[PDB]
Symmetry: C4
């Protein structure tokens, strides 16, 4: 049966460690893929870690948008290895989600001025999307969000240092049944972290142009959308300035560049995941701001340490566990963090929201380079 | 349930990348088989990559018709490794197909003057075919075509540089229920790429004797056959002469030798896969000729680049995705290309026909030799 | 269906060898995890070997309570390898049991003064337990015991060289439904080996403070408990004094330190597993004492050799095979022994109780260090 | 459902190659077990290759009746590797068979004067047999034969160079329900190759004492047995004298030592598998003698080459494919041959009987030592 996606997010007070692969430590002697942009998506039976690889192993001579880049997956917490990974698609930009029946995989390959998103449902090529601006067509690098047998992704075509073009897609059994181009002047959306919540999708993305707070887009199944930036003074992007009275549009100071991130909206409040360091991808923390989605103060209630400031962090993204898998009545928010090493590889650690006691530790990669 | 095979081929305007194993790059450090003649066949659940190997790994001192040659298979896009490959049969010439119930595997082993085709259904030896000419009995090196619980293959016995003997087989549950010898003087059929289309089989083969255009044979379930050459001036074999006013029989100029290929017939039109270079196995392109199956001009409508002219290509062959697996109403045409390196090994890339937008790129092997 | 857990233990007269992984010998050349604290738990279909690892392989540069420690599992008798192990949880102290429906995993991670037990049911984080004394929260390092859809574990918080705090937990579908703190002054419980027997749980634990005989706790499903020490003069812990007229409380002579062990209670009698050497973790033997659970003599009836005195032994723990898996009418007692080498890695051998003929041999690790 | 075992053997005229693992060639670079005594048994779904290993890989410093010897299995034709092998039992002498429901595995371990056969049904220890003569208790080293939910094996206790003691066992769900000691003075039975045929079992064994022809024992489900030697002048054992007028009891000339073999009885006729060389384990051939089971001439009708005389052979043993797996009306005879290399390892090739055309080739190991 297909995921309903109509329950609310469970309210959470902390984040409990779900998984850790230790891929680089094992790949020092074992045959482990050099991986980039890992993300986790869950089926109603189990959760999988998806990753992009060029077919180069750790400690090998063969180790962004190459023709050899493929999307592969393993069960969560297992090493990305040639002997246990499942091929998904050829992709240097990818997304994947399970609608309750089969796996949808969106894989983008091709040249920078001619890229095509290849949509695969149950391993079968079902649809393709041409680049509409011929400037690096790219997608979430995280899981897509499925509601009621239909899965949703956000894709960007255009410059990563200026105004680009952002599209929302409705996909059913791998086929695009509705496409909507967002009208968002002075916005910038890269690598969206989309999750379902009460039959609607909320994506928290990255402003690579002029924003150090994170843009967001929320839409329903017929793709009527709303846009804005997370108005909290606790800025989510990296690089970013010091915490101050934030803006409700894009914060221009240290607004260029960025990192893929996420945020979970709880009414007027937001759970914010961000790096600890304001300049480099170092550290990770979860911050609960009960008025941060709309209010502009830099006041926060809960801070939980995820990765220590001396250890390397990187991409972060959301994923959810539906009631069809958990047995619960609500959608469990979860996230992963990529711990980049460097070749250039990186393992991943994942956390799921709980309403019980947790502890703020550091769970770093721990490989000797 | 068994595959019906009564639907037509879906009309396609482009080819979308399905899979890429990157076997040599991974086998630089990993334990990956040295493989030759890889081909892809699909069950109603999933597609598998079949390959021949001698039990020698890449970067190993143990690396054509040896007693050690075996047919093995992996899930599509996974590396051919001893730790994940499934044994199929002992074979230095092979074919495999799924009828909807079980896997049929046809494996040819034995001496050159005494070879025997071993037919295995669900891993059980069900029938054997002796060599009837005692001169290297050989078969498709690609998937066989199944229609209505019955699978069909073409086999050759005789010289590869002259007139040989060609047979068509009807196989049900691994048992040969009808055999027909083709009466084709001045023809030559090697390594046929057979596909089902509207309860009939069409095979596009290789003339190793005196033809630079490809011979074809089409037959029904009772093995009444028709023969000819693809009459287009866009010649399919490699080596081949320059494009000119082609012949409807064999083209003698540069007609000797060749490469395993394929073609998809669409009424009077044909999709032609061929190497880009006319002398060496370099490059690959898909050419749509709307009158190429019977007309003799060198005019073509669509050309899509598959492999660039500077990268090594090799064997190509067809495979299909039935409606029992895709959920569609038509049979999806698909093909694979072997990218030979060199030891002598070769990874494979695969494409499936789509009626949506695609891009002509190059997806080469990419291993440093 | 869920395990009933209401049948008695089968009476056994000997122990038959169930499994042997030979992990260090294979990890001399293969890619095998460096593992510590291995234990075996059984589902109604198969038995699995659980283990803790840091992601370091044998013969590798990367080889107690680190952030990188994870709980992983393999099928019983298979090597702990990155290519075949299943991730369970992040843990430097762990327990796992199958209730007949899904796997429960209890994983303890975090700092020594802030550790949290993470409970996962079917891979889903269901509950967490904070440390209540902030002094290394720790658990069984063996299987938990499930009776009637509910699984039971014992956890310790406090000093390992003095009086600590001991808690009993009732867990249903990964959720703690009842917790009881034991009132046991002058006792000490570490690394309990709990098994079900006639709708009740019996745990045989380790006194690290002042006991060379083993403490025990027995409780029902509503966690009404009884406590004591195994009163036999055949002392179970290591280190221990010579066999003498033992005490029914803790034996203070050589009572400090210890090793994780087990014992099976049969009315007034006990099957005692212990090291052969009284000072070092060397050797292993199973001793049947028909009055040892309450009587204080050093008289015994059966002694079966498990590991010879010259070979290294280590942690031992119980596990059971339920009638839902064996088809029997009784619960089969079984145990494993960790053969520590040294890096520091330890393979494991396992035995199950039988009422037929057996032999006392030695089944050592056998790796050349 | 359980195998009926009541159909006759299919009459066969030749032997078709079923499988070849190429284990030593792959283990030159890959991580492959050093294996001895491989044998093949089949479930109603698939056939598996069982083997004994010490946990030592090929090209490793850790490479008969050791405590580390274990019985493991892989799917047929796959390499014996730590990453894909399934543990069965601890054993330096083994047998295994599938009754149609679960796998029965008989594993013998322990000291030479105290060995115990450990019987496992579905991975569960169900019964044990003590040594009754305290002189190396040993069993078939091939598959046991199951008829009507009951499986049968032959075991030997006593000297391998003189009169020993031979027992027949009836096993149901892993439990010995009937045992019968054979009264066979001047006979010698080692490593029996037993197969079912028309609700009865026939075992063809090895005379290590004073016989160069093979002894046989045939019995029904209540273990009423008949004994004799294969009376053909085409002698089956190795070493053996030249072909002459053979005896119907044991042939004393070159009767000492031997090799594990098999034979298939077809009324008064026998299919004989034997080495080509009369002194060393070199070559293998299948010989059809239509009067060889009782007649004493050295006349034969069919000889098919299996392994050439210059290549190393070794242990051979029978196995069968039941109608529950093949879909046929008869039991298909099959056999395997161990190609010993040398460490001391050896791959295996397997053949199944067919009533169609085959060819006598050589399928050797092919590893460079
Ligand atoms: C600022 C900065 C650094 C931007 C950069 O070089 N690379 C970005 C990146 C990263 O790790 O940052 C990882 C991805 N591999 C990139 N994606 C693609 C399709 O290549 C992504 O780039 C995107 C998003 C900005 C735009 C093409
Ligand atoms: C011209 C030319 C080169 C022909 C040649 O040497 N080898 C051919 C080949 C290739 O890669 O070309 C690959 C196959 N391994 C060959 N098949 C067999 C049974 O060996 C095949 O040969 C066939 C088809 C011609 C005839 C026996
Ligand atoms: C006496 C003695 C030696 C105690 C010691 O150093 N380590 C103990 C141990 C062992 O192998 O003995 C293995 C475990 N890794 C330890 N567990 C934890 C949570 O670290 C355990 O320690 C426990 C139990 C005493 C208390 C924290
Ligand atoms: C002639 C001769 C002696 C040959 C010898 O040393 N070993 C024999 C053997 C072989 O490869 O021949 C392989 C087996 N590993 C042996 N089996 C056991 C239980 O060890 C078997 O021995 C059996 C059968 C004779 C008697 C114990
Ligand atoms: C959400 O979907 C479930 C499953 O179909 C349904 O029972 C429930 O009523 C829905 N929720 C609401 C608020 O309608
Ligand atoms: C194809 O044949 C099958 C089996 O004969 C039949 O069920 C099906 O209807 C046929 N297909 C079409 C499109 O009619
Ligand atoms: C255990 O409980 C089951 C039902 O859950 C019951 O049928 C069975 O008789 C009980 N066993 C004993 C030994 O009481
Ligand atoms: C074997 O036993 C089965 C039991 O169902 C029976 O149906 C079958 O006829 C028997 N076979 C023969 C050859 O007698
Ligand atoms: Ca930014
Ligand atoms: Ca040609
Ligand atoms: Ca103690
Ligand atoms: Ca002999």
């Amino acid at each position: 049966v297909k995921l309903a996606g109509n329950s609310s997010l469970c309210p959470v007070s902390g984040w409990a460690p779900l998984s850790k692969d230790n891929s680089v430590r094992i790949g020092s002697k074992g045959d482990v893929f050099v991986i980039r942009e890992p993300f986790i998506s869950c089926s109603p039976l189990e959760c999988r870690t998806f990753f992009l690889t060029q077919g180069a192993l750790l400690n090998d001579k063969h180790s962004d948008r190459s023709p050899y880049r493929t999307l592969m997956s393993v069960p969560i917490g297992s090493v990305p290895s040639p002997y246990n990974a499942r091929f998904e698609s050829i992709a240097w930009s990818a997304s994947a989600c399970h609608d309750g029946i089969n796996w949808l995989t969106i894989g983008i390959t091709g040249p920078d001025n001619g890229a095509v998103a290849i949509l695969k449902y149950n391993g079968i090529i079902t649809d393709t999307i041409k680049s509409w601006r011929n400037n690096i067509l790219r997608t979430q690098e995280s899981e897509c969000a499925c509601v009621n047998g239909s899965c949703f992704t956000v894709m960007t075509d255009g410059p990563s240092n200026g105004q680009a073009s952002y599209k929302i897609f409705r996909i059913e059994k791998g086929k695009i049944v509705k496409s909507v181009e967002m009208n968002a002047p002075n916005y910038h959306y890269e690598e969206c972290s989309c999750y379902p919540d009460s039959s609607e999708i909320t994506c928290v993305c990255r402003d690579n142009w002029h924003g150090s707070n994170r843009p967001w887009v929320s839409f329903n199944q017929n793709l009527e959308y709303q846009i804005g930036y997370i108005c909290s003074g606790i800025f989510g992007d990296n690089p970013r300035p010091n915490d101050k009275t934030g803006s409700c549009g894009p914060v221009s100071s240290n607004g260029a560049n960025g990192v893929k991130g996420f945020s979970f909206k709880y009414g007027n409040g937001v759970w914010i995941g961000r790096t600890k360091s304001i300049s480099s991808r170092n550290g990770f923390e979860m911050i609960w701001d009960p008025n941060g989605w709309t209010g502009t103060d830099n006041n926060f209630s809960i801070k939980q340490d995820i990765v220590g400031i001396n250890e390397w962090s990187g991409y972060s993204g959301s994923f959810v566990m539906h009631p069809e898998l958990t047995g619960l009545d609500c959608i469990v928010p979860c996230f992963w963090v990529e711990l980049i090493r460097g070749w250039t590889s990186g393992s991943s650690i994942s956390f799921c929201g709980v309403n019980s006691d947790t502890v703020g530790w550091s769970w770093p990669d721990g490989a000797e380079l």
